[PDB]
């Protein structure tokens, strides 16, 4: 076999959208199917866990509502909020 990046998309979860990582994962005491219809869990094909919701949302402080495009001119603002810069790279 060659270097195949093809990810396991085949399965019962061949739905038309990908759910959001259960921020609690397997630690959520909700086992009702609805909990899984919008959140993916550790074992789901739709699970990724690379989202802030699933790994961490805080880092250290609240996030700047304007992102890195925040034009709010204040050093204290930059101190209180996270100006989350994104890779947006094609590697
Ligand atoms: Zn859950
Ligand atoms: Zn800002």
Curated annotation (Swiss-Prot):
Q: Binding residues for a glycoprotein, per the UniProt record?
A: 19, 24, 29-30, 66, 71-72
List every stretch annotated Flexible linker: 49-59
Q: Which organism is it from?
A: Homo sapiens
User: According to the record, which residues of the full protein are present here?
Assistant: 360 to 448 of 511
> How does the record comment on the protein's domains?
The PBZ-type zinc fingers (also named CYR) mediate non-covalent poly-ADP-ribose-binding. Specifically recognizes branched poly-ADP-ribose chains generated by PARP2. Poly-ADP-ribose-binding is dependent on the presence of zinc and promotes its recruitment to DNA damage sites. The KBM (Ku-binding motif) mediates interaction with XRCC5/Ku80 and XRCC6/Ku70 and recruitment to DNA damage sites.
Query: Where can this protein be found?
Result: Nucleus; Chromosome; Cytoplasm, Cytosol
Q: What is this protein called?
A: Aprataxin and PNK-like factor
Q: Describe its PTM?
A: Poly-ADP-ribosylated. In addition to binding non covalently poly-ADP-ribose via its PBZ-type zinc fingers, the protein is also covalently poly-ADP-ribosylated by PARP1.
The impact of changing residue 22 to A is: Abolishes poly(ADP-ribose)-binding and poly-ADP-ribosylation by PARP1. Does not affect histone chaperone activity
Q: Where are the zinc fingers (PBZ-type)?
A: 20-41, 62-83
**SUBUNIT field:** Interacts with LIG4. Interacts with PARP1. Interacts with XRCC4. Interacts (via KBM motif) with XRCC5 and XRCC6; promoting recruitment to DNA damage sites. Interacts with XRCC1. Interacts (via C-terminal disordered region) with histones; interacts with histone H2A, H2B and H3-H4.
Per the record, the similarity remark reads: Belongs to the APLF family.
């Amino acid at each position: 076999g060659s270097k195949a990046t093809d990810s396991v998309l085949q399965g019962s979860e061949g739905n038309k959208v990908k759910r959001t990582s259960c921020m609690y994962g397997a630690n959520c005491y909700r086992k009702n199917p609805v909990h899984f219809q919008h959140f993916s869990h550790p074992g789901d094909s739709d699970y990724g866990g690379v989202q802030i919701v699933g790994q961490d949302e805080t880092d250290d402080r609240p996030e700047c509502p304007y992102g890195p495009s925040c034009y709010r001119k204040n050093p204290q603002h930059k101190i209180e909020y996270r100006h989350n810069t994104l890779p947006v790279r094609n590697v």
